[PDB]
RNA sequence: UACCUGGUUGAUCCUGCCAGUAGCAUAUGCUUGUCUCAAAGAUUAAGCCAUGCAUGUCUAAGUACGCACGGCCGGUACAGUGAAACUGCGAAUGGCUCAUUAAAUCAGUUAUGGUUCCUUUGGUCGCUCGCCACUUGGAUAACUGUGGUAAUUCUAGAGCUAAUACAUGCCGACGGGCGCUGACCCCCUUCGCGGGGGGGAUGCGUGCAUUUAUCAGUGGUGACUCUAGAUAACCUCGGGCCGAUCGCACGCCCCCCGUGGCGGCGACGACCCAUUCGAACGUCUGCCCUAUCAACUUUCGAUGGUAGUCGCCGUGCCUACCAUGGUGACCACGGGUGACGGGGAAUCAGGGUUCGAUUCCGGAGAGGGAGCCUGAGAAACGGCUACCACAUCCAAGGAAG
RNA sequence: GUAAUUGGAAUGAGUCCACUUUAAAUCCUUCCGCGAGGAUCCAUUGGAGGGCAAGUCUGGUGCCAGCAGCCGCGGUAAUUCC
């Protein structure tokens, strides 16, 4: 039964306004989400129209998006690592619009080295023989490595990037709104957004 | 006032009640009532008791356990007379619908069968 | 008809008010034959209510196995009338009231060479390549039989029975195509070279709507982060669609072939687009008296910034962190109103003065507050829940306002 | 205009059958029948000094009782009371 609306505010100059109606329905009650990493817990709500939409209690994966490389997928959430609004939301891992999260990268890396024919997240070698060896070489045949070798000049990656794909967590940033769609997508920070949000976590 | 499943606690206390629950006919759409209803431990604070068999024993109670009481109304959609009768398939299920006689004395006598649905 | 007359004096001319004069609108007094219209518990008490009522609903087309009636038209699913009950839709309109409310309401403005919005109206509903489909599953009501209370539109157990209720779920189109991958093309320059293309051996993704990211720039608006397109993907188990629905006239091909296939008018539906009825929240301008009401607002959101949380969406709407602002003698702020606002009403030279509770529109509230269910639409009151006030029956245990 | 005598193709208010009206009714209209000489089938409410149209008629009361929105009228002959 809390509302929503204007006319208990005070007024521009100052002044106390008597109020003229009861507080109606079009000014809906509104208990937050506080959505949490866990396992699915998704409730519907309907809403005027007889609409739903989905307030998401507590969610696992994500759909977050790269955009230089175009790579979406599905991945799934380590943590909630900083938060512009309010501090109190990170110890406490609450997953809002605008918070930087954290996601693994093995979808990413099953992509970028199932695209181009590199490494990626090996620094040290010695452990790559069963399954990582074999995905780079293949024995392709002519014309495939005729056009595999000409991508070697767009699969750098900025050096704060590849950091990240190497001890396995990147940090990304949720767009979506999760508690009033059912979901947590986002995008992975990259760049000057990156180096942004690493002088802030690092400085805390 | 009667009893209720899941209350667990002797004596009369009071619900809200929504429809589906039990011990409650709502007369519009979405309305709910407060009303008051018993608990599902026994007491000797009961008038009568509601008491159901499931297994017969030694014998003959009178008027209990004896003089079946025929199943008058058979059944009306085409999926449950395949599974009474059997019907393998096809079996022309118009043919094997339960007729009922119809027993009128000011009237000649009757036998009425319903529709068929699905 | 732009209109005056009597009263201060012993008389006079003035100022000045009193009184007279005419409407109209309340109440009353006396009186009252006819006839057309007709106001009418507004002012004080938005005081309190006995009783009766004022919202229900069936077509040819959701569900009849009530013998309650029918020709039971003859040995079979039903010639139909049909009570009741489930289901669906209405009950958010109309009616009444004027207590609240002073920039608030309100008003104006915005060829085959290949065989937010139920409804209504208009759209769209083989666009998806994936052992029942000639029809899947379970439960319940009316009914029958046993009951409980002093009691109410209270209901319990036991057994049946249905769907356009509540779910589950496929064939067809379906022949395919696009995009990404990918064991064989040599014929290019194989000269030791570097090769330039078409083909497929493989396995995924493919529509509509939802969520997110990126690239390019069908049709439009002084204007778009519009619409439409393309790629990468998501798709919530209180799960988004892609007819397990009902009448009516019945036919056509019947060659696989007397057992099968194909067809017309509808009625209910159904995500989305548009429309319609609106609703919501903003812009600008406009209000009575009051200074014996001159500073007000800002811990407690007051004015703004950033990020979000919810909300149908914009917004301190709410929170976190910041900046210290907003308003005022052009009357803020506070108080009063015997304040519902307007269209209008009486008056009448012009200019004004007064009234508008009252049939039209808008708003607000159903004893006072507060919280919710259902629904497209209610913070509903001839809907629920709780307190406060008043009040009802009782067998004293409880029931209903 | 006293004052009549009358009466006349005068009429309604009322009374009352019949239609019409209306969901059914009542009214209004339409039309039989009756229904007017103190037509007793009865017109009232206020005033009569001025403002302000209308009496210095008669009796009663005597600054009493009362009237009068205002000026004022009433103390034994009141155009102002009853």
Redesign the pocket.
Known sequence: ?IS???W???????????P??????????????NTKIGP?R???????????????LRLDVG?F???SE?????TRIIDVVYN????ELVRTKTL???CIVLIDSTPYRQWYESHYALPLGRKKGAKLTPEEEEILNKK??KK?Q?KYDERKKNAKISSLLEEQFQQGKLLACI?????????A???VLEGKELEFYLRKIKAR | F??KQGVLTHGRV?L?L?KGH????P??????????VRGCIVDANL??L?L?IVKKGEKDIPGLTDTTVP??????????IR?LFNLSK?DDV??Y??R?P???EG????????????
Do not use: F
């Open positions: 039964g929503r609306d204007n208990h505010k005070r007024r521009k100059t100052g002044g106390k306004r008597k003229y109606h009861k507080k109606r329905k079009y000014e809906l009650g509104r208990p937050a989400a699915r998704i409730h519907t709500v309907r809403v005027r129209g007889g609409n739903k939409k989905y307030r998401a759909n998006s790269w955009g175009c790579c979406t997928r599905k512009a609004s309010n501090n809002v619009k605008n392709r045949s495939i005729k767009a979506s709104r999760p508690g009033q769609c059912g979901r997508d986002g995008y | 009667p009893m009071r809200l929504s039990s011990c409650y006919r007369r519009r759409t979405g309305e709910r009532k407060r009303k008051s008038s009568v509601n159901v199943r008058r109304l058979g059944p009306k959609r085409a999926s449950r599974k096809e118009r043919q619908v339960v009922k119809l027993n009128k009237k000649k006598p009757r036998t009425k069968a319903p529709k068929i649905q699905r």
